[PDB]
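Rotation project, supervised by the postdoc (A.L.). Task for the rotation student: set up a whole-complex structure prediction and record inputs and outputs verbatim in this book. Inputs entered:
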Amino acid sequence: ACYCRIPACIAGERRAGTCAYQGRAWAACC
Amino acid sequence: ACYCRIPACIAGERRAGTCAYQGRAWAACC
Amino acid sequence: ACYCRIPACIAGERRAGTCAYQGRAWAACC
Amino acid sequence: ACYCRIPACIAGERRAGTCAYQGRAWAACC
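Outputs recorded:
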């Protein structure tokens, strides 16, 4: 599936949404 | 539906999930 | 703050993120 | 960080939040 990162997705991935945990918003990278 | 708040939902509401925007995680209050 | 809707935000609002509750992804409308 | 799954996290992981993408809510597993 998809992995949560900040500040943005890395090479090979593309951003498809967000995650929410530990108080912040993360990019969901798929 | 549901309204995003921090740090928590108010009287009359119940927490049902999360929101993610402006870099942070908010409670979704229903 | 912001209100969760599907399929999209209404006039007067702008989409700023997502909400997650009851199993689905909602627009966070601010 | 954390990986998005449905319906729930697997052994070795803990649920810390949610992900939102492709229209659905996923568990964020850390």
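Student's summary: The interface with chain B takes residues 1-5, 16-22, 26, 28, 30 of chain C (CB under 8 Å).
Supervisor addendum: Chain C has one domain: 1-30.
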